[PDB]
Structures are given as structure tokens and as C-alpha cells.
Scaffold this active site. Structure first.
Site, short mmCIF file in Angstrom:
data_model
loop_
_atom_site.label_atom_id
_atom_site.label_comp_id
_atom_site.label_asym_id
_atom_site.label_seq_id
_atom_site.Cartn_x
_atom_site.Cartn_y
_atom_site.Cartn_z
N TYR A 201 0.91 -1.14 0.00
CA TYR A 201 0.00 0.00 0.00
C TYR A 201 0.95 1.19 0.00
O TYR A 201 1.88 1.22 0.78
CB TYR A 201 -0.82 0.05 1.29
CG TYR A 201 -1.93 -0.98 1.36
CD1 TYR A 201 -1.67 -2.27 1.81
CD2 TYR A 201 -3.24 -0.65 1.02
CE1 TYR A 201 -2.70 -3.22 1.91
CE2 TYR A 201 -4.28 -1.60 1.12
CZ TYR A 201 -3.99 -2.87 1.57
OH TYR A 201 -4.99 -3.81 1.69
N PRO A 293 -12.72 0.07 -0.40
CA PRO A 293 -11.85 -1.09 -0.63
C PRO A 293 -10.65 -1.23 0.32
O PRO A 293 -10.25 -2.34 0.64
CB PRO A 293 -11.37 -0.88 -2.07
CG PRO A 293 -12.47 -0.08 -2.69
CD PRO A 293 -12.81 0.90 -1.61
N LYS A 297 -12.21 -5.29 3.46
CA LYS A 297 -13.26 -5.73 4.38
C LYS A 297 -14.63 -6.04 3.81
O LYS A 297 -15.44 -6.70 4.46
CB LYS A 297 -13.42 -4.69 5.50
CG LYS A 297 -12.15 -4.45 6.31
CD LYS A 297 -11.92 -5.63 7.23
CE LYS A 297 -10.50 -5.76 7.69
NZ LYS A 297 -9.86 -6.98 7.09
N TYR A 385 -6.53 -5.95 10.37
CA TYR A 385 -6.35 -6.40 9.01
C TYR A 385 -6.70 -7.87 8.81
O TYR A 385 -7.30 -8.23 7.80
CB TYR A 385 -4.92 -6.11 8.54
CG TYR A 385 -4.78 -6.11 7.03
CD1 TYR A 385 -4.58 -7.31 6.33
CD2 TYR A 385 -4.90 -4.93 6.30
CE1 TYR A 385 -4.52 -7.32 4.94
CE2 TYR A 385 -4.84 -4.94 4.90
CZ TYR A 385 -4.64 -6.14 4.23
OH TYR A 385 -4.55 -6.17 2.87
#
Ligand SMILES: Cc1cc2nc3c(=O)[nH]c(=O)nc-3n(C[C@H](O)[C@H](O)[C@H](O)COP(=O)(O)OP(=O)(O)OC[C@H]3O[C@@H](n4cnc5c(N)ncnc54)[C@H](O)[C@@H]3O)c2cc1C
Ligand SMILES: Cc1cc2nc3c(=O)[nH]c(=O)nc-3n(C[C@H](O)[C@H](O)[C@H](O)COP(=O)(O)OP(=O)(O)OC[C@H]3O[C@@H](n4cnc5c(N)ncnc54)[C@H](O)[C@@H]3O)c2cc1C
EC number: 1.14.13.2
Lengths: 394, 394
Positions: A201, A293, A297, A385
Site C-alpha cells: 500500500y 476497498p 473488508k 487487518y
């Protein structure tokens, strides 16, 4: 026709619920507006929580996933020219996430349903829901011109954000919470090997970027783009150039590019409705809530709604405890709100917002620096997460 | 007159720096605009981090504090009619905070300075700073009409938010980050016993409330109020009634009320300047940054700036390593930004904001529910509340 549970929608939610239900001896019929091909064309999700992986195993549809799914023990976050790895497995007490595309999961469920011979009516046009508070609700639809009626005991609305089920609940009985973000995600799917063995990310001044994957030879990349963008304005080459500009130099250097198999823009939104049920109607998945997004989840919350609905229905049918169904919303919402908070937080620390003053930019940077440098901070990201535990029930 | 270090301001920062410096053999003169009485009239801080407690001991001014200070091992956060205790000691790995008023600390330092006979010029009018980049900077001031000059090697600006030192740095060399909040804190000091042995931060629909203390028989309470409020509109009785309306019933029930010894409104603000030095001038404390009261970080960050400046000056004088002083800002800012992030976070989850949509209110509630219910979440609050470690240097 008559059945026990009518399910509106043949996306992941409806199929998973139908499978769990069929296996336990509870007849159910699925009605889907589109064709199998259309449903299968939606790329979407790539990351699954352990809870979802277990539910698939319980539904007996985990053969291909156990073979082709990739298990990840960590993810990376890049910011200010530095990459930081979050050891999910170590920091969450041993849990991991599994990368297996939503297209594959959907394909696996469809095949499993066909083999067992349960009812699925595709191209069920103009579905309408009736007598939601009666003791005998029913669904009407059109199949090749003729209006047919399906009688059932309960109806599960698994029809996504634009479905008919949420619209069938008197608007005054519903409370809506929504946030629309001033950006979307431009995604590109390519038959190229992923640039890394784990996701990356990235928060960059030009905007958010995400390096994901579907297998050893298929990649999925995303870049943040403003809402004014049209996908036709983004050639494959323009995308790769933009992607590379947002990644750390050492990552952009080894990136294998290639033609897009699919390109699309997904706008970001947060949405929750309370309650998630009305009479004999129960909402699940995207029909009841949308999460941006970031954090992966969406499909994962659908799975917990499903796990919860299935178990309550089992109690009602097998044990004659229909009163427990009144607890559905309360149970689901606890997990939904915590996942919404997580997706909201991830989105706010990783993306670049339009009218941001100097103080906010510095706080955004510091949020990253703190959570990524503290063992307690890393642990809050990690436990969130991998997915918070499912509520037991009763 | 001539000295080694000129210090502008006789609040906590200036006095603590002067004391540490004097003890190590580095002469210093403090110039203060006000009278001792005026400075001593400011209530302010009540909570000290362990790092501050240690610095006071190093300065040799901890006798009264060790005797009268109250050590706290936890704090409570009340929200949605539920109280949750954060075991600071357990969750931070053994650290605690000490409640000892800023008025007392200031009194202790002033007495210590007088006894050692170091120079302090009160009522030093219209202080001006000159030749900041020269090898010989100087300060001019007015004492009973005559303009006097003080020559020094370095100048430490410990004059607070409205001081002259920050204004003396060419505006173009400074970068400012600021956030003003749409509310203030109405505080009331009373000679009544505290309602609890530990602090209670409360998020209530009517606004924020905080139950604090100064000793076994002196309490300090605060309530959030809009910026349009004038303190003359708040009788003692109106305040107690409002305070009680914001606390959990069982807490409001045992609250001992009484006449105010002091009442005042403090507006909330976040402010940081980069760098914190210019030539031979170094800013410390409120002169360089302001944090909203939530989290009790203001006086505590001043202490770390001071600890850092003192040690760098020691190196410069004792070891002839004056080049290390160029690192002052970089070192201080790392801790300042993390504390700012913490105060900002606390403020945002505990207060009621004016134009808040339904989604935000729910996220605010969920932030509390998550951090207060997760061991990793509780730990992020706790390690931040007790105070992050000081940077070593070099
Ligand atoms: C860019 C992107 C990335 C994502 N990444 C992830 C990720 O990695 N991990 C994760 O957890 N989540 C992720 N998500 C979220 C996830 O894809 C969704 O939450 C998931 O699709 C929800 O499934 P569902 O079955 O509830 O609804 P849907 O998938 O939308 O399916 C609903 C079905 O109902 C049918 N239908 C609609 N209206 C009617 C009607 N009137 N009558 C009959 N049938 C109807 C529809 O045709 C559709 O087939 C992502 C989403 C996107 C857009
Ligand atoms: C409601 C409230 C609650 C707080 N609670 C806490 C808490 O519990 N814990 C904590 O860590 N922090 C807390 N703080 C913050 C803390 O009080 C401040 O950070 C602290 O006062 C900073 O000290 P200082 O010496 O840097 O500046 P100050 O205390 O402002 O003193 C600066 C001095 O410089 C003098 N001066 C100004 N201009 C000149 C000039 N031109 N020439 C000469 N002298 C001048 C001033 O008169 C003043 O005496 C609180 C603050 C408030 C308002």
C-alpha cells in the site's frame, strides 16, 4: 413454487448462504437479475480473512482455494520513500490472510451449487417482495415474460448496493449513515508476475497506489484518481507510467508491465443502514453496507453476516427457536462498525485529500510514523487487518 | 551586563532551563515581562509525565513534589454511560503520571533560583533581540525607564505563545502549522475533595467534561463550551449543574461542590513552527508549539525541549562541541509531532463538534469502543499518555 428461504442475488453472499443452507437441509432458491457470465465478469476482491476461508471450508467449497490460494503473513506500507512491513502473523497472534480472487470464489460456489442441484433462477426480472410482515411472505419475478410467484418463510436480501431488498423496507424504519469520498480507484488486471510477494500500500504525494495480485502470474494494481476521470482517458501505458511514479524507486525498477485484461474505476464510499432486517426480510453483504476497498473488508463482512444469518436460521429450523432471529442486526452491526472504522482509518491515512491544510498533511504523515513504528500501533493495524473475531451468538 | 545564556520568560520552561544550567556552571539571566505574583497566578497544568518528574529531580527541585505530588496508575474514560479504566502502569510497562500543579512547580523553581542567587529581572519591559546571526547577540530591555543591554552567547526563547522571541525570527524562515478548534475549556478550581482518585475524561452528548485534581482537598474540573462564551455568564452554580449533567449518574451523585477559587476559559489550538531556532536563538515550550490541553502534553513537551537544549548547551560549553546545537530542531520536532498527534486524537474522540453528520458521530463512538476494548488499542493510548521516551542525542 415454494421454498423455505428465498435468496435475492447470486453474488458471493447469496451463493455462500445458499450453500451453507442447502448442506444443512434447509431448502432455498436463489433469484438473480443477471446471467452467470455477467456475475463472473466482476473482478473485485482479492484478499480473504481467515474467517471467510473457514466458512468456505464449512460449505465444502475449499478444494481449489486450498490449492490455488496464496497465504500472506504480512503486507507493506510505503510512505515518504520508506517501506515498512507489518508482520500480520507475528502481530496478530498467528492469523494470516489468503489471496484468492472473488471471481474464483464465485465460480467455486456456482459449480458446487449446480452439482447439488439446488434451484437458481438467472435472469429473474423485476423481483418484487411482498408481505414482509405477514406469516407468509412471497417474491414475484418475471421469467421470459410470465410473472411467477415464489412462496417462502424468509427472504435474505443478498442483492448488493443497488438491489431491490433494501428499497423494500419502509424508508422510515431505516437509519442511514454515509460518507462519499472525493476519489476513486482505477484498477488494472494483467497477466504479469506481481512486483512483490506481499501487497504494498503506498501513500505518495501524487495519490494512493496499491500493488496486489491474484496468483504467481496475474497482478492487480490500483491508483487513486479523482471522480472526474473516465476510464477511456487511461491507456495501459498512461497507467503504468502513473503507477511507477507513485512507487518507491527500487519497486518501480523491477515492475513487469503488460496489457490490461481489465480496467475499471471504483468510487469510494462508506455506507451502513440500521437495522438490517424488516419482518421476514434480512439484509446481508453489500445490500446492508459498503466499505471503501482499503483494508479488504467488504466481502469479508458479507461472510460474517452470512455466517450469522445461517446459524440463526439453523436454530430456527432445527431447534424451533425463531425468536433468536430478532438478534441478527444487533450481532452483525457490532462487527460492521469496527470494520467500517478500520477501512475509514486506512483510507484517511493512505490517500491524498483535495483541500488539505499543512497541519492535516503533517498529522497524516505522523499517524503513519506512529502506528508503523510502535509495537502497540502495529498490533492495532494487524489485528484489524486479519479480521476481528466473529461473535458467538445467544 | 553580560552572561552566557539569556533566557526570555520566567514560566516553567525558562526557570527549569535556568536551574539546570546554573547547576552545571553555565551562567544565565532570566528576563520576565510580568511580576512574580502574576506568573504564580496562572493555574494551568496538573499532570506531569515521568520524564518531567526526573528532570525536576535532576534540577534538584523535587522535595515538595515527592511529598505532595499524587502518583496515578490509571485514568478513566466515560462514554455512552459506561466508564472504562486504562491501566497506565500495566499497559505502558510500568510508567505512571504525577499530579502536581504547574503553580507549585513554578513556585518550587522560583524559590530554588532565589536561594542559588542567579539573576532574574522581573518587569523587564519591551525586550528586543539583536544580532541573532552574529557571534555576539544581545538583548535590550527597559527597567524603570532606562534601556539596558545584556550581552550573551545564546538566547533561549521561553516566552510562551505571545512572546517576543518567535516574532524575532524573519517570518520567511519559518513554516507554521496550525489548527484552531471551535470550542474552549471552561475550568473551575475549588477547595473540595475530588470525586475520584483518578481522572475521568468524559464524552457526553452535551459536550466534553473532565474531573481532575490538585491534592486530596483541591479539585479542578473542566467543561467544553463554545467560543462565544464569556466567563461572567457562568455562575459557580451553573457550572456544577452543567458538570453534573455530563457525568455518569453514579459519579454526579457523590460530587462535592463548592465555591470557585478560580474560573477561566481556555480556547483549544494546535500550533507548531519549523524550525525552532534561528542563529543563536532557540525556542522552547509554548514559544514554539501549542497543543490542546487534552492528554496533558503542553508542559510535558516543554520539558523535553528543555532537556534537549540543556544537554546540547552543556556539550557546547563543557566539550567545545557547539556544532551539535544545529540538531536541536530536528530532535525536538520528532517528539513534538507525535505528542501533537496524540492530543489531536484525544480531542477529536472526546469532544462534540458543531457540524457533525451521522456517519462521523458513529465513527467517534466506534473509535472509543475499539481502543478501549482492545489490549493493543489500550496500549497505544497508555504509552502515549505516560509520554513517549526522550531522544538520546548525537
Ligand atoms: C475495487 C474493489 C475491491 C474490493 N476488494 C475487496 C477485497 O480484497 N476484500 C474484501 O473483503 N472485499 C473487497 N471488496 C468488496 C467486495 O467485492 C463486495 O463486498 C462483494 O462484492 C459483496 O458481495 P455481495 O454478494 O454482498 O454483493 P454483490 O457482489 O454486489 O452481488 C450482489 C448480486 O445481486 C444481484 N442483484 C442485484 N439486484 C438484483 C435484483 N433486483 N434482483 C436479483 N438479483 C439482483 C446482482 O446482480 C449481483 O450479482 C472490493 C470491492 C471492490 C469494488
Ligand atoms: C487549561 C490548561 C491546562 C493544561 N493542562 C496541562 C497539563 O495537565 N499537563 C501539561 O503537560 N500541560 C498542560 N497545559 C500546558 C502548559 O500549561 C503549558 O505548555 C506551559 O504553561 C508552557 O510553559 P512555558 O514556560 O513554555 O510558557 P508559559 O507558561 O506561557 O510562560 C511563558 C513566560 O514568558 C513570559 N513572557 C511573555 N512574553 C514576554 C516578553 N516579551 N518578555 C519577557 N517575558 C515574556 C510570560 O509572562 C510567561 O511568564 C495546560 C494549559 C492550559 C491552558
Amino acid at each position: 413454487m415454494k421454498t423455505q428461504v428465498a435468496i435475492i442475488g447470486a453474488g458471493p453472499s447469496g451463493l455462500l448462504l445458499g450453500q451453507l443452507l442447502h448442506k444443512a437441509g434447509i431448502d432455498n432458491v436463489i433469484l438473480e437479475r443477471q446471467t452467470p457470465d455477467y456475475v463472473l465478469g466482476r473482478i473485485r476482491a482479492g484478499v480473504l480473512e481467515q474467517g471467510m476461508v473457514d466458512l468456505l471450508r464449512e460449505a465444502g467449497v475449499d478444494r481449489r482455494m486450498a490449492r490455488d490460494g496464496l497465504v500472506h503473513e504480512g503486507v507493506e506500507i510505503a510512505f515518504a520513500g520508506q517501506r515498512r512491513r507489518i508482520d500480520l502473523k507475528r502481530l496478530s497472534g498467528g492469523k494470516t490472510v489468503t489471496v484468492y480472487g472473488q471471481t474464483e470464489v464465485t465460480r467455486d460456489l456456482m459449480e458446487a451449487r449446480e452439482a447439488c442441484g439446488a434451484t437458481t433462477v438467472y435472469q429473474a426480472a423485476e423481483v418484487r417482495l411482498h408481505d414482509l410482515q405477514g406469516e407468509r411472505p412471497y417474491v414475484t419475478f418475471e421469467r421470459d415474460g410470465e410473472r411467477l410467484r415464489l412462496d417462502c418463510d424468509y427472504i435474505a436480501g443478498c442483492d448488493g448496493f443497488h438491489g431491490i431488498s433494501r428499497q423494500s423496507i419502509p424508508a422510515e424504519r431505516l437509519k442511514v449513515f454515509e460518507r462519499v469520498y472525493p476519489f476513486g480507484w482505477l484498477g488494472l488486471l494483467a497477466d504479469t508476475p506481481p512486483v512483490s510477494h506481499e501487497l504494498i500500500y503506498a501513500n505518495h504525494p501524487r495519490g494512493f497506489a496499491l500493488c496486489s495480485q491474484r496468483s504467481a502470474t496475474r497482478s492487480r494494481y490500483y491508483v487513486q484518481v479523482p471522480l472526474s476521470e473516465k476510464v477511456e482517458d487511461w491507456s495501459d501505458e498512461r497507467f503504468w507510467t502513473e503507477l511507477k511514479a507513485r512507487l518507491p524507486s527500487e519497486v518501480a525498477e523491477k515492475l513487469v508491465t503488460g496489457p490490461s485484461l481489465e480496467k475499471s474505476i471504483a468510487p469510494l464510499r462508506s455506507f451502513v443502514v440500521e437495522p438490517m432486517q424488516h419482518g421476514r426480510l434480512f439484509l446481508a453483504g453489500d445490500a446492508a453496507h459498503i466499505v471503501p476497498p482499503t483494508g479488504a473488508k467488504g466481502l469479508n463482512l458479507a461472510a460474517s453476516d452470512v455466517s450469522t444469518l445461517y446459524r440463526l436460521l439453523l436454530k430456527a429450523y432445527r431447534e424451533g427457536r425463531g425468536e433468536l432471529l430478532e438478534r441478527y442486526s444487533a450481532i452483525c452491526l457490532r462487527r460492521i462498525w469496527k470494520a467500517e472504522r478500520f477501512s475509514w482509518w486506512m483510507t484517511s491515512v493512505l490517500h491524498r485529500f483535495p483541500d488539505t491544510d499543512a497541519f492535516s498533511q503533517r498529522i497524516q504523515q505522523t499517524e503513519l510514523e506512529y502506528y508503523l513504528g510502535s509495537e502497540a500501533g502495529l498490533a492495532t493495524i494487524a489485528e484489524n487487518y486479519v479480521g476481528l473475531p466473529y461473535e458467538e451468538i445467544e
